[PDB]
Design a protein around this nucleic acid. Sequence first.
DNA 1: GAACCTTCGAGGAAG
DNA 2: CTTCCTCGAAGGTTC
Lengths: 313, 309, 312, 312, 312, 312, 50, 48
Amino acid sequence: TLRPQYFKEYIGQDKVKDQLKIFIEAAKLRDEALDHTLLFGPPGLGKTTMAFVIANEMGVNLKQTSGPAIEKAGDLVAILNDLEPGDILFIDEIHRMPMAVEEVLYSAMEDYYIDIMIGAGETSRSVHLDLPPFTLVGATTRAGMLSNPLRARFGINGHMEYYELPDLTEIVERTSEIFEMTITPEAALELARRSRGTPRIANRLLKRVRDYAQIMGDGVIDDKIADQALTMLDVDHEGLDYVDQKILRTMIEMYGGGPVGLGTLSVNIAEERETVEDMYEPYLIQKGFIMRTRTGRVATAKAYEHMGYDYTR
Amino acid sequence: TLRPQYFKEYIGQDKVKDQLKIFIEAAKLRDEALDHTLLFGPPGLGKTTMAFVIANEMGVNLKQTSGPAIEKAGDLVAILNDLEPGDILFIDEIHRMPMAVEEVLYSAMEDYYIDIMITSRSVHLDLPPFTLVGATTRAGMLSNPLRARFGINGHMEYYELPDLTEIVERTSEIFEMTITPEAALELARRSRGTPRIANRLLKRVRDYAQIMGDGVIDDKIADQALTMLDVDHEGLDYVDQKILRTMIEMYGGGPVGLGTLSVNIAEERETVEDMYEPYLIQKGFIMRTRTGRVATAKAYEHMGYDYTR
Amino acid sequence: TLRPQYFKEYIGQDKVKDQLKIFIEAAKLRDEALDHTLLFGPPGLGKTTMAFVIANEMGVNLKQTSGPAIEKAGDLVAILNDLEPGDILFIDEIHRMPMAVEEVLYSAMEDYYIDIMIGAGETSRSVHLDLPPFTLVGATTRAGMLSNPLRARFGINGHMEYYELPDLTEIVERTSEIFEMTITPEAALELARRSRGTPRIANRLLKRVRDYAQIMGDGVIDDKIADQALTMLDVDHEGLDYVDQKILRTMIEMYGGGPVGLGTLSVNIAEERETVEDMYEPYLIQKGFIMRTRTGRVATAKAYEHMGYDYT
Amino acid sequence: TLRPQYFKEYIGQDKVKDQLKIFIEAAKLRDEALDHTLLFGPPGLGKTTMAFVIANEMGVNLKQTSGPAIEKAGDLVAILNDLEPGDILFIDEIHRMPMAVEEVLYSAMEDYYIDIMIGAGETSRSVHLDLPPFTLVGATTRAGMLSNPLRARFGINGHMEYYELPDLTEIVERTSEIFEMTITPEAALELARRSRGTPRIANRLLKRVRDYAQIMGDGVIDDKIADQALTMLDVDHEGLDYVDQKILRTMIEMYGGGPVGLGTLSVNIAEERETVEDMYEPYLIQKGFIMRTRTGRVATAKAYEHMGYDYT
Amino acid sequence: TLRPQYFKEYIGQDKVKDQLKIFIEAAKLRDEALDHTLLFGPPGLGKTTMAFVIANEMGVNLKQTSGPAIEKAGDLVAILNDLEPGDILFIDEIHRMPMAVEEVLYSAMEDYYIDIMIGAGETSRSVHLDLPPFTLVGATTRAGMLSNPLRARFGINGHMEYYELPDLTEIVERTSEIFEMTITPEAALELARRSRGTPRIANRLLKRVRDYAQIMGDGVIDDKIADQALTMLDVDHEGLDYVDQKILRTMIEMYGGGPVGLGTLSVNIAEERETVEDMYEPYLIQKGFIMRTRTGRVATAKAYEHMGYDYT
Amino acid sequence: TLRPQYFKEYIGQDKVKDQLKIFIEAAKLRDEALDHTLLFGPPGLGKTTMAFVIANEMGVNLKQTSGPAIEKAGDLVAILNDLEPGDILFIDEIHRMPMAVEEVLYSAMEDYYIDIMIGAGETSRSVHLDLPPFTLVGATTRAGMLSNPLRARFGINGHMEYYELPDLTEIVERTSEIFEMTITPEAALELARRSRGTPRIANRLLKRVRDYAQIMGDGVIDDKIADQALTMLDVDHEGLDYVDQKILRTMIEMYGGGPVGLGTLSVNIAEERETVEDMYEPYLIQKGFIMRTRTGRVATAKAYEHMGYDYT
Amino acid sequence: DAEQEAVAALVALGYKPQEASRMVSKIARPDASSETLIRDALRAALHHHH
Amino acid sequence: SEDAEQEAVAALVALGYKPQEASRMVSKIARPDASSETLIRDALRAAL
DNA sequence: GAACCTTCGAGGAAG
DNA sequence: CTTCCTCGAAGGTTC
Ligand SMILES: Nc1ncnc2c1ncn2[C@@H]1O[C@H](COP(=O)(O)OP(=O)(O)O)[C@@H](O)[C@H]1O
Ligand SMILES: [Mg+2]
Ligand SMILES: [Mg+2]
Ligand SMILES: [Mg+2]
């Protein structure tokens, strides 16, 4: 499989990976389960993959479900009864759980029991269900919309981060070894530099180069073939698409850097307002090529020096 | 028929057409299904046409649906249950699907399985290898997790004069109407770079030659027909010419505000901005400025006035 | 009736009327339906009237509805599939349809079919629904509000224009014969020149003169009765209303022609800022009495020689 | 009752009354419904009262509703279904209706029909609802908010004007007789000069003076009681309130008459920027106390003598 | 109970009482109801109490509700059908009533009848209700948030102002007599100055000082005890609240005295805009702690010397 | 103890705790119920714990529910009917209950009875229910969100606030004994400083340091070990979290300290803009690291020297 | 008459007429007042907890 | 057994299950002597 | 340099 | 969740 399976194999994320190891080892030094854990980060950094590694390293079985699939208290309680001592329950998109079920989880996490009240008046009674020890692991992309009483129960937090060239290269090397293709280390570096720090992008580029290398070449990925393949595709050495280059060129040549409004820029490149703001503008901001101002977008000196145009304040 | 059936018939789009040929050949050589493809770009450039060509080149039976029709998960689940190995599912206007349905697609695209709850009950499906092809005009309206799963992105571009000339002649032979090479060129210049617009002009000119002529399109009939439609040799409409004239003769080229200019021509503000200005800006006849918009030197030469900076 | 029924009776609109004649005749020789048509332009110029004329000249039945009535896809899907070969579907105020409903027309207009989801539960299935040849006709004042993919599908575009004095005079005379009133040719011209170029306004003035002539007169309209009636309505020989005259007078007597701001002018006439800019200012600019500049409104020479002052 | 019931009791608005009489008499001779009419202008001048007078003169029943009460097209269709031949429908604050419902009246006013979708939803189709002859009367404070296609359909327009002192005095006298109070002609003229030309204000002051004149007066509104009572109510002999006086006084004592800017002056009086510009300044300009200039606004000589300062 | 019940018990508000006495008495000679009255001003000054006094002097029953409690037109109809001749309806927070409902009050107030549509579909029908005479009393914390169509229909207006030292002292002495308690004149005068000129605050503090004097004293309130008790609470020497201190300490430290807009300040102090604008700002401005400027509010020299900072 | 029963056992909150003691015993001397009390402040400070202590000190059985648990007026009336003389009812998030409840709660709190009206027209009756004396205790996270007329009924206000360093060290020490962890006074003070005032954070940090010290050390939390453990957790010596340093670090390196807007900032770091202005900015501004200039956020000198960057 | 009065009062408190009838119908006391019935119909339906 | 049968059915209803489906779920359990905890545990377990 | 006028651009609460 | 619209900033002219 592509997904790593153990900390020995899981590349990167040394910060979160280093912390979890100490907590897991301390839990094993006692007859206790791991504290409830919550994972944060942007889309595509391994949040799903890390859950499996934690279970394998704990020497426990993994239960898996998703937030939207749970709608009545019995769903969660029924799943919770399946958990054996120390089992790990992984809930994806935990922020989408309905309040009707969210409110049931508090006594489970803190006391390991549920106390179902029933009846009315003189018939009012309750039943107490003991739950075996367990560890809830949650993953979310929009942490800010969780409720405060839930966030107060998680004892361990993990922030995922973008991978870096010295390690993102190893993912290409390893992935190129699952297919039956030899790749030069210098070629893998050229692919990593353009993957925006995201594993899915690195894999997508590698698949596209593989097709070219075996139809327009000898079925081997050398530095020479990589340059041709990356020339058929629009992706620049900084990872900018054809349209990304066209945006920067337009602002500098026609508006002298701005400020320029979103609507005025859209009609010049012939694109929708929603497309420029959501597809192309986000990466240009993170890379530091443009800034947003109350008067419109404006290009920074960092953008001038990359396009190769003279700059003056 | 009007829609090309194979890449040998598909004129233009050399960039997108070249990439799709490489990826289609490689997939066949490995006996695998093609990756998921997203087609996006301006209206009328060929997105829907290319989706059928891909299926014909792959040699598969195409399933067709549309985003506005899928209202609930039960609709899409029934469609997915009918897919067989290698089938292609094409969803047009994919941007309309409710996000409650897109979340069901996140896993089906990666792991090829569905394990969902749907009088309520559970449902499980195992999906054979299949290729999803999406076409949209509002690509930015799709969620970031969905766009990240498409393996091929095709961005459509406008056509050049040689490509449009060849297209006009091809369509003329389907109507079995005779047209000369230089007559076809005069229609291409006026088609604004869009194949659908070029076909529309040809249909209108044909109707004239059948009623006011001998049923043959020539350099003489074309000039008369185009004068009746009142379309300039740059493709400017009557209203487009009225805008540039008003700016040069009443405001000395500007700057002028959108509100002032609209009232002066008796047009609605929203119509000027959304229907006439976009082409004038892309061709370089008008520029937007912090204080308004001004007519460029290109507009002066086209209208026949002496420019003064 | 008050609406013309054939091109023989439809006065004016030479540009639009001439084009439709050629396209209608060509469609008949090929024995096929007419292409889709969009009619747009200012209010009261004859858009709705032309839609019925097209149906009569084509010799087919006309099905009619309106944009505001179609609120969900179920409504439009039901109107479709009730069409017969060669039918004409006319939608008025087409700019009001929801965008989620417009996108259903994309397949229908280009390929004459639509995709439908049918049944329920395990019986849910998709099916193609195939439509016979038909012609869609749309009329709107706000063409810029329609989506670009929809406007690109209309094969014929008709932009309406304001009428001229010879055409308006003939329209007044025609309407005067639907009623039972005699009107002198010299008096008919006197109304046409005050109708701002719009057929609906010309008909409204005539109705008001009819009521005066049969109460304060002998039931006949002549230069004497016309001049008197128009004095009661207070419409000058250029078509300026009572408020229009007050605006021009105030600009020439207090500010010496401007420049002056809209707010300063509105407060001095006791009008509100929005009524002046939306009701009265638009016609004064299009007719050349006022000029808009970066510094404010200015009165032109044409206003001075009309109000009787000297353009010093 | 306070509201006049017939054109013989309706004081003022001579321009509007003269026209309505001719159009109502002509409509009767033909035995037809009256054309649609729009009444617009400042608040409290008599628009609602004129609508009831028209109903009595035509001799028909008036149905009544308001713009903001209608929230969806279903409501409007229900109201129109209740109409009977010749009924008058009065819609107050007509500019408050949502645009999506306003566009439904377009066919009803011109052709007396409405397109409506019917059926349970599985099977449905459109049908014409056919309306009887009727007259729509609309009243609005700001006609500029109505769309151009709607304003074009109204056949009679009535623009209301402020009342002059001769006519406004007759209204104060008429009201005193209904309250069974005796008022000296000199006193009626005093209340008129302070009523800003609005009948609603004149009636309110009379009610308060009447209460005061009988509790600590001798039961008669003499010229001396009015002066004392109006001092208690804080109404200047020109109708100015204390806030208006504070503005004028500051301009004379702290700026020598100006010019001064609106922002600077607002701070010196502890008043909100937009309140001064919209609530207080308009009346001061129309009366001639303040004048706007390119460099600010200036207090005229009239404002000096009214306060007693020395003009220079 | 503490609430006064007659004009002889209601201390202060001389300007408002004098007017209400005349109007209420004049309305008693004639056998008719009082005109609709609008009371407005800061919270806690006694405008709800005045509504009870008005009812007792007239000798009628009082019904009480609030704007937010009415959600739909049918709610008001049920309430208005439950009013007897001459009853008084009191509506608090009248500025928050829904616009679709506010339109119904205009008719009931001006014409005493209600036109309503009831039922649905084919059962939709109008109803006409004729109401007995009644008096509406409205209360609002905002003088200018009401619509002009509403404010113009109230016939009596009353602006209520903060109480002066002699008045609050008498109110504290009266309240300390209903409770079984003893207070020296020196202590009552101190507590009054500390009570922000507001009767509700004065009564609330007195209840708390009473508890301290029992547990930490001999059961008698003296200046020596009142000083200690008020210093144990957050009440400052000038009566400033904990919220007041935060505001002043933020303006002087986060903005160097300002200027700063109250809108942006609201979110920095973690206080709701409407509460700080209506409850706190009016007192700080009226007492000279904060001053108005073109850009916003600025802390005066008095504020710096009070908080102990340096007036650099 | 960590879960105290009486005030002598409760750590911190001396101001609130000192006021409650006087009011509690003062109410006992008079043999009457305590006045209604409102608790407010940041979450997790101990509001729910304090409610139990108040019940014990009074000597009454506590009853507990929450605003969201109540859905209709009958729900509250049922609970109130189950009360016994002197009972204390605690409502968490009292501001979240629907207004239909507040309308009944008013007379309940003030009159100790409810009067459910019934009947219409000629029929009108009520049922009057007697209620025993009781004390209501409410807790909220904000003051301004509570209904204005409701907030006036509470006679006692308890402003909770963040703990000081001495209190936190004591809580840390007690918690460590439960875990059987040996911690020196210096280590306990280091954790207290960085817990930024909230016990929940202090408990979380201690658990994590325990796991580290049990493996990377000898199970004894020394100052040398505590400081190393905190750097591994990436917790700054000022209590700044990982994301807090990222915001400051980003402004300095990518924007030279700014100015920069919230929209741009929330896009550079992959976060939801609401989260930043709600969770992270409040603590950074209060501690003087970030300033909210009108143009945008700017890094102060403290941030430059704290992060270790030479100021401009 | 107290039977209908109690049910009408419970309807004002938000109970459905069907449930209010069932609730009041569970109690039986010919001499009970609408008030003492309400104080019983509510106590019988509220879920007490310990 | 009606005590355990009623408790298990009523407790299952408190978890959001319908009265009919709750009856069917509990009706599938054979042992009457087992406690409501075991009845609900097995009832929920069988529906998983 | 104080005061007016026009034009563009980005939020947020009323659907 | 979306469209409208209103609040704010700033370029340019004149005394
Ligand atoms: N003039 C007064 N004399 C005596 N008590 C007063 C006076 N004004 C207000 N109060 C008392 O202070 C409180 C005011 O409450 P209320 O009148 O409801 O304030 P508002 O209606 O302004 O919100 C009541 O306890 C009332 O008895
Ligand atoms: Mg994942
Ligand atoms: Mg297409
Ligand atoms: Mg029409």
